[PDB]
Amino acid sequence: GYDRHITIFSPEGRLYQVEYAFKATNQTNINSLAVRGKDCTVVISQKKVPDKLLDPTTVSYIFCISRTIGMVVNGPIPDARNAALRAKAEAAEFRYKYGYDMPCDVLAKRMANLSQIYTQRAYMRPLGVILTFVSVDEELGPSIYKTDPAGYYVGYKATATGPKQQEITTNLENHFKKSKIDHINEESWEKVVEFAITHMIDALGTEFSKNDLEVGVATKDKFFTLSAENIEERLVAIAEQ
Amino acid sequence: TGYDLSNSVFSPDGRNFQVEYAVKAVENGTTSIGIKCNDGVVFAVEKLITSKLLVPQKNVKIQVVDRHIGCVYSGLIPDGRHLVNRGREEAASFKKLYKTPIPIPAFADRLGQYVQAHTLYNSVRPFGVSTIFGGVDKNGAHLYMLEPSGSYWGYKGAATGKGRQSAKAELEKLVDHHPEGLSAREAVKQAAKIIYLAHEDNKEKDFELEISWCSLSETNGLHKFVKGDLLQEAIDFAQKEIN
Amino acid sequence: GSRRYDSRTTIFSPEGRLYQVEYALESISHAGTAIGIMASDGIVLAAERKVTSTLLEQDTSTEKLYKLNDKIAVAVAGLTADAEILINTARIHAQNYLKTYNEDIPVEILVRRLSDIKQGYTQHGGLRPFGVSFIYAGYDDRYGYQLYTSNPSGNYTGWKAISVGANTSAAQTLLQMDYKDDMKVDDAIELALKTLSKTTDSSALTYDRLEFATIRKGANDGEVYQKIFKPQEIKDILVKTGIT
Amino acid sequence: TTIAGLVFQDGVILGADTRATNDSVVADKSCEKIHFIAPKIYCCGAGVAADAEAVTQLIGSNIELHSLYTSREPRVVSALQMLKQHLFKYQGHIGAYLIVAGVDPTGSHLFSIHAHGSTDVGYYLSLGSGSLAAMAVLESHWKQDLTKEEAIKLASDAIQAGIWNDLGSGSNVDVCVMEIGKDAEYLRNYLTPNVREEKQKSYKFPRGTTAVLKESIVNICDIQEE
Amino acid sequence: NNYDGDTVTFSPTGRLFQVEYALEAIKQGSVTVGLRSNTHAVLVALKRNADELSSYQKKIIKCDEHMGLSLAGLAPDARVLSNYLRQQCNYSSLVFNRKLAVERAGHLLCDKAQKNTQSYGGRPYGVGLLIIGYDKSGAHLLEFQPSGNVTELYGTAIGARSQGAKTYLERTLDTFIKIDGNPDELIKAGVEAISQSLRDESLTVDNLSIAIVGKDTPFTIYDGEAVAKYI
Amino acid sequence: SDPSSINGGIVVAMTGKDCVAIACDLRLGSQSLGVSNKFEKIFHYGHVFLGITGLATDVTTLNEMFRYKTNLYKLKEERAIEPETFTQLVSSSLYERRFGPYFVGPVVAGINSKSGKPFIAGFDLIGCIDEAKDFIVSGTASDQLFGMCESLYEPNLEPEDLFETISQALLNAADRDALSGWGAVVYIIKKDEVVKRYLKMRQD
Amino acid sequence: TSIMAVTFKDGVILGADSRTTTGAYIANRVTDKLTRVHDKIWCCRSGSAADTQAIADIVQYHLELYTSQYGTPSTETAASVFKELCYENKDNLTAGIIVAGYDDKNKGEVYTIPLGGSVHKLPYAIAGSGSTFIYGYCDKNFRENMSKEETVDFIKHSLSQAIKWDGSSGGVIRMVVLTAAGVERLIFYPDEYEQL
Amino acid sequence: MTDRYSFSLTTFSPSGKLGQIDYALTAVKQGVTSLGIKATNGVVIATEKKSSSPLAMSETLSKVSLLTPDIGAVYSGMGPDYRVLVDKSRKVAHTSYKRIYGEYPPTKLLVSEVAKIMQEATQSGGVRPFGVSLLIAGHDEFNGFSLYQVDPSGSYFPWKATAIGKGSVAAKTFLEKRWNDELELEDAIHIALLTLKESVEGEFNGDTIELAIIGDENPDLLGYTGIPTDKGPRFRKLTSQEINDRLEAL
Ligand SMILES: *[C@@H](CS(C)(=O)=O)[C@H](Cc1ccc(CN)cc1)NC(=O)[C@@H](NC(=O)[C@H](CC(C)C)NC(=O)[C@@H](Cc1ccccc1)N=[N+]=[N-])[C@@H](C)O
Ligand SMILES: [Cl-]
Ligand SMILES: [Mg+2]
Ligand SMILES: [Mg+2]
Ligand SMILES: [Mg+2]
């Protein structure tokens, strides 16, 4: 049964190492969510600092890939950082060669093609991560594109990733069935972050303090992460209505 | 089964068993710790005196990278040395190109990516060390701990090896009892105590204490070994606390 | 390391056989039958297509008979994709020879080259061999009309008539029975089709199932013509010989 | 060679003469010096003709593959960056001097590229042996917010200045207009001011004038067949 | 068991079996002793013969004028590692006009051995080394294991029955460390130490191999009638 | 020293009404020494004709190279190459030796078998294409040929008239060049017949 | 070319003419020689335009990749990357670059990198063909900790003289102001600066 | 940090089977249905947009890809493997053909190059075969319209009409009854939509179906005017609205 150890086909036409890499994705037990506003793209992710000895400021699964592109990872941190460093290198090389900022969807495709190579070439293992790329693209507007260990990628109106992704997904599905639009009809990103947090609270059934969340926001010409105090301001506004 | 025979193979769980087996080599090794203080970091390590024939103060375990970073590790000692050698190359090329000495977070990812790369192929073995390292850069003090998987985080206190649970419990008390922070000279004393307390797990053979530190005020942000009177003061403090 | 997953494609069995060559030959025994017959005034190449579907576009289709140069053609039995890799190499070797010596490549030299490439895959590199057997039909001014075959081992041999692929045992007995040395192309055409008609696993032999070709020194003014038969022309020769 | 490019209200325009030379002899009286890169990106070429042609074709090919890969309209800055990095690599040994212009989602753009890999940004540019004749016209008459009708007039005038006053330049005027929100219109032989006058005599010979030693039919067909 | 096919594989308890099997080749090797004072450092080696017609396999190799080692295990691997040491000692002299520190020599051997334990295809070195030297910080004795572990010591022994000599040195520690400016008495203590590891056989003239380095003493090897004095 | 004028020679090509003509001299020399009076410079690959002037070793090498490439083209495409496509193949092949070029002046001539359109083209030694309606010239007497063609030529000449025009263009140009002449060949090309004629000219 | 960078109280200002010549022909009379390698790290280019553009493009790439990993680079770091390219490829380059940048910690800094690939940290720097004519003027009139208006006048007067005497220099005087407040572009036309 | 897999991972078994190719074909069988039909004046290729989530924007995932202006491709099997093949196919059309001959390759030769890439993954060291079957429809001047299938082995066959993937056996039978040599392009699109409805479970509309044609030249889609010889791409992807119009006359 060596068809389960390397990336070759099983008799069923399956790649077991790819399937097991998908399982490694949930090893962190962290749930992420991404939504789009009018002018922005918001990504939120659970933050869990179990050890008191840890420096909580260094515990993060959100990465600033370029000025415009942000990336949240669902999976172990070594593979997450492997993917982050590569995406940063690719985004920089793109800008140098072609004279404009790498689009979110093109980076996603590039990383997905790299992921595909690990599913076809035996000596390289798949990375056990799901990469969710976010930006406000200058042509396509607010953008969410997600990559997995299979090398699959697609654009999203909104998305969720983690152990409890299905609960978050259906919550978001039901909202967009009502509104009948592809985005959160909201002017400020602050209110789009409030929406994202609110709908994660409803979906997961858990309350959040400032240290339990981690937020990334993409606007036109920059992506940034919120501090604990910026999130606290968000949590106060949710509670007050 | 057979998923644990080759490195870089995912088990049906989503685990790399060879990396988990490297962790066992780390757990088998001597105790080493790191303490983040107000303006720096302190490193300490347990050195088992196998025999009277070992020359005291000679078999030095703690290693310097560049001039501002200290590294200590538990597990397979040669694997640790290999990682520090790489760390030194990474710190040299960073300084060569960018002039400034390598920041600690930047240095941490250099080791992180290198260790992680040794979980990507069956043609290499994972590292059999957990490495506690850190120092002072332009943004202040930083302490890190890096595992065989490539995983690393920033720490207030860190501990690894055979006496890690004992040490971790002692570090957790210091964090609770000193929220405003710990001084560099205090951290040296506490480091000595923690290694002495963690020695109950390796209690058969007697041991030799080794401490180092980087501190903005006490060492000008350079890595130095604790020697002579300051070392003996820490040993006396540690000996007093166990009795 | 990687050693664990290595099949070791280039080793001897205890009996002194090359495992992968033998298993490649087993693959080839299931492929559609190809027959080559050499006459005094030409060579016939006949071959049976494997995938009968009514929706297959036959007139633009080529799975069996390929042209290497103006003087040399091949009939394929085995993996078509593998054969095309080798065919393009053979096409290049012919043009390298023509560029170097300003003469068309002798048939045997082309055959030996391809056969040597196949041999290499059995002795080094750790790769699987090519799952292909060729029938080479060709002409040159030294030996005249020549038929050869090569197989995955890289061994090649010359023939007056020969089959490869499926039912070669049965096919070779029938050819050995009805072949004669003074035979002509028109007679060899009839023999080739009659042999396929008896050895075929199908219910009946039809035009949509066949690829057919002739190399004749019966062109205008003593030249050599390669004719790859069109579907309608295969249908006509089937009526002429009295099979349909 | 006289090539020029200038910007107008909602677009960019390129101009070029149609003469190719070998030292003092005219090899081609109607050659196309406005090269195609993408549907809405064009490149005026000067210097070594094979080099200008080859470098635009190569970058045009890579721009097409990039456009397919990214699912986007190609940008002029991409063509610019790729051209300059290629030319820089070869240290001027690829003697191509180019004016690149086009429209993309960013807007309309106009650049020049020198053989060693330096690039300029401009509202009006000219290259080749007729550049000074053209630039004199552009410096005299160019203004901001030109209409398309004024821009075509000015571009063709700039090229004409080169045609008449520069020996390296001649024959016809090619133009390419790239306007925002519209298909680029390529206007080969936009002006034809140099048609040859009717000859005084016909030099058609009486048949049998040339002495012949042998005749034969050439077999061009495949296989004369039975 | 299943995890000993190559050096690249950890066992479930975090062990490298190929390294441990290389370690076993040292235990099968003939005994050699190392010890030092503040002024001198001594190697004593029991050489092994194939039979009575054969020569006794040489155990001691010179690396520089101020450094050398004794071996126990695979002699060809000692030749590779000693050649590497010779080159590193030589590089230090040619480039920096500097005699290589004995501590730094150990670090280089450690790192060279380590590379063979982490990569596929290679094998660990099948030999243990005792390096003695005299450098700018006085006399030194090192013990090299092919796991990579190098250890600075006052005295030690490696090879078969080495535990007998190692215990003797552990008792004698306070005496032999003080043997300063007296090479013959330091060798006597090494010869008496290696005698504790003997069974059946005793120290003959072509059996025993001694080497010494010190303050005003280059690394020199004594064999044959030169060691009859100490029997 | 100048490779393009060691061996000498010329090629000219012209279009006519439903026809093309290509012609060349027969000289091969070593500077002043005449060596061969049978060195033809026009080759054909199916119905596409290629004339090549310049360094004779490269003339031979390129002929062998384009025979090679058009043979493989035909095997893969299952049809003969057309003049427009072959022109691009010549250009590609020359430009790939940009910094160590073949010292030649190629000339393509032929009729597109599908459209019936007469086609001629010329190139420099690194592959720049000159596609002409009227005529193409090449070789050591290219200046002389430009002068002859530019005055003698008129469009839409019938095959037998075009023969006279191209022949007189070649002969009179060759007679003003020391390194050209020693015989000449003219190919008259129509859609499905090609006539080849050897001309009588002065042998100095 | 006449280019300069001048540190002052609030930060640093880069200044340049706009003339690019091919011999005696002015190929571009409105060139922008002040080029951005990072938000608040800019450089002035002199020498081969191809070489300085190629270098600046590589530096911008390196600092973009630095920022993704390690946050905002220092001006010293930018100068080091410029130096590394210039020094290691000194046999194939003709580049004279002035690097100028604003940190909040270090405030305004200026580094000059002449032909050899050496680095020199200075209070102000001048370079390009037209700089020879203003060494005297700049040395006499430069003061440390000038105001923004004084530094703009110092650069305007300096480059006005460089332009006046150097044929290779001319056109408009472009400037780029680097402070905590942000990035300000200034332009000054012939009719303004010639009458100074 | 070495690639030590220099040996074939696809080998002959005792029965003569190449296991990995057979298993790749099994993966293709599990994949969503796609089909191709050739008319007299065009070719149509079609497939279902099987959306993995309703939050996903299925417009961004293109199963039907332009390879050249006159050639298009569709697949069944593993989507990532297809995506990288399209990237390589587009590139090889330039490097091994357009940069040499100054024109796009004919359908059969581009197919031959794709086939070659797939064959190499079936014999080279340390790789598995591609887990896709492609349908490649195209036009060129001398061969006219054509439709090719390409399998994981590297083998390719020309078809009048065919289907691959999930419901291919049923779909091929449906096409055998309906296909004739006098079909216009509109008739072939109509038959393609009828055939594809049988294999689709859920919604059946322009948003869940992807359909493209190789037909007449589209000078409107070219993007520029002024060259009479360049008349525009024959490849055209039908819009969501254009599909829905034909579903009313169904
Ligand atoms: C004008 C350029 S100028 C006089 O420098 O301003 C035109 C520009 C141009 C650009 C593109 C095209 C067509 N795509 C045509 C014209 N350039 C020239 O006319 C150049 N001419 C050539 O390069 C000629 C072209 C042949 C076809 C006549 N080639 C040569 O003169 C040399 C080229 C060559 C150069 C270096 C090494 C080898 C050869 N050859 N020969 N033989 C410009 C050079 O005049
Ligand atoms: Cl890619
Ligand atoms: Mg793999
Ligand atoms: Mg003459
Ligand atoms: Mg003469």
Ligand SMILES: [Mg+2]
């Ligand atoms: Mg001036």
